Nucleic acid binder design. Structure first.
Ligand SMILES: Nc1ncnc2c1ncn2[C@H]1C[C@H](O)[C@@H](COP(=O)(O)OP(=O)(O)OP(=O)(O)O)O1
Ligand SMILES: [Ca+2]
Ligand SMILES: [Mn+2]
Length: 430
DNA sequence: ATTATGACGCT
DNA sequence: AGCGTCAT
């Protein structure tokens, strides 16, 4: 009852850019705007692999991981933009730099956790407390929430989608009790007002649109964000969780999309997140371990405590290339040349990072993959990163991996390498 | 031949 | 440390 924690202590948002790499390319090239289009890497094998898709193109069934040649079968007029190639490899710098544009704007509003190249969590608890004082108990107008969906509403006693959005919003606002500065629902609402302002700022200052989720924790915020894309935001209240979760496949919740989620389903014989409430905490811990069990017990009730970490910059800087099928590296000279290509991009990114962010990487991690193994990584080895020098880093990488070569011959490399990966880690202030 | 990343957990 | 999982 009264001692039952409800996980309503925080206001957390997740802001995620809409079809991000596509928008970056559409900003640059106006001919691509408001068109079915996709971003592709490489071109020679099956037209290239699609890694981002505009919403116009998704309507034709175009998806990520599709070969462009196959996408063109669904959508003959599909427009394509190619990822830059430098030193023989796809180079994602344009998109990393566009990400920084967005992250710096968001950081003006609150502390953010960079979660990916195109999304960040926002801890709005303090900003909300501030805005609530300035509101001085004055009600929140629907005009302050022009792109907000309230999940689960409208309910009870309608043709248009925007009409539905407004009906739900008005039911929500009509019910709000604004005299209580500590009502979690009010706090979420003010959170949503701030996220409208954040999202407006992002679009004004970059040209990019995004979606957002507002809830009491990261997992609900992430789930919320996806419920109404593109270019909209969704508030998931604590009260909305039982209905929302009652038909929510377990795999949809962040961290349950893989083997653990499959095991929850198989072992417990359930399908939906809400069905988890019928197990004791000890029961869940018995099957999934202490940490996962406790996490699942709270999460299926809408409760999660993972903090928004104050981190705007990536913790690692890495360079990787696959060498599929018959392109697999089979000579020593080949392996060395590509290590150098990777090391040269890494040096360039590292040197910029040091100037921009007052830090230096101290460890170089080298990963490779061998033909036959379809684990992502066959082997990882670390060495000291003492100088930002591509020739040294590539020589050092070769040194830590050269032992994997089972070839009795000096020049030959066996089994051939199907992946190389250089990652700079363990930053220190400088 | 679903590529190029990036964070975090386990032992 | 080196491996695995999950994610975008
Ligand atoms: N599996 C991947 N491989 C390579 N790049 C990826 C992959 N997934 C995502 N990206 C890149 C391209 C995306 O534009 C960007 C952001 O990913 P993501 O948020 O999942 O989709 P998206 O922004 O393209 O569309 P959406 O509107 O659905 O969010 O990261
Ligand atoms: Ca996105
Ligand atoms: Mn994303």
């Amino acid at each position: 009852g009264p001692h039952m924690a409800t996980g309503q202590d925080r206001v957390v948002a997740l802001v995620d850019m809409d079809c991000f790499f596509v928008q970056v390319e559409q900003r640059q090239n106006p001919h691509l705007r408001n068109k079915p289009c996709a971003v592709v890497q490489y071109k020679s094998w099956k037209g290239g692999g699609i890694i981002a898709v505009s919403y116009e193109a998704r309507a034709f069934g175009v998806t990520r991981s599709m070969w462009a040649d196959d996408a063109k079968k669904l959508c003959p007029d599909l427009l394509l933009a190619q990822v830059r190639e430098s030193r023989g490899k796809a180079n994602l710098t344009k998109y990393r730099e566009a990400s920084v544009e967005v992250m710096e704007i968001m950081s003006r509003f609150a502390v953010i956790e960079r979660a990916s190249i195109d999304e960040a969590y926002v801890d709005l608890t303090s900003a909300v407390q501030e805005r609530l004082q300035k509101l001085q108990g004055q009600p929140i107008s629907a005009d302050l929430l022009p792109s907000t969906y309230i999940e689960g509403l409208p309910q009870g006693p309608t043709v248009q989608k925007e009409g539905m959005r407004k009906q739900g919003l008005f039911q929500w606002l009509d019910s709000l009790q604004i005299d209580n500065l500590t009502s979690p629902d009010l706090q979420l609402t003010v959170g949503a007002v701030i996220v409208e302002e954040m999202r407006a700022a992002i679009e004004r200052e970059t040209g990019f649109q995004c979606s957002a989720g507002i809830s009491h924790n990261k997992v609900l915020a992430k789930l919320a964000c996806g419920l109404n894309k593109p270019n909209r935001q969704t508030l998931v209240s604590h009260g909305s969780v039982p209905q929302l979760f009652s038909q929510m496949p377990i795999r949809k919740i962040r961290s349950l999309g893989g083997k653990l989620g499959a095991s929850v389903i198989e072992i417990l014989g359930i399908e939906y997140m809400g069905e988890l409430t019928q197990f004791t905490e000890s029961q869940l811990q018995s099957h999934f371990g202490e940490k996962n069990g406790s996490w699942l017990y709270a999460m299926c009730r809408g409760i999660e405590h993972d903090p928004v970490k104050p981190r705007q910059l990536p913790k690692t800087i890495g360079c990787s290339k696959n060498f599929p099928g018959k392109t697999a590296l089979a000579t020593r000279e080949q392996v060395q040349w590509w290590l150098l290509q990777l090391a040269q991009e890494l040096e360039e990114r590292l040197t910029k990072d040091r100037n921009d962010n007052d830090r230096v990487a101290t460890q170089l991690v080298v990963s490779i993959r061998v033909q036959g193994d379809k684990r992502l990584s066959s082997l990882r080895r670390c060495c000291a990163l003492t100088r930002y020098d591509a020739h040294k880093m590539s020589h050092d990488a070769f040194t830590v991996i050269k032992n994997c070569n089972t070839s009795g011959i000096q020049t030959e490399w066996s089994p051939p390498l199907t992946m190389l990966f250089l990652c700079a880690t363990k930053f220190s202030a400088s």
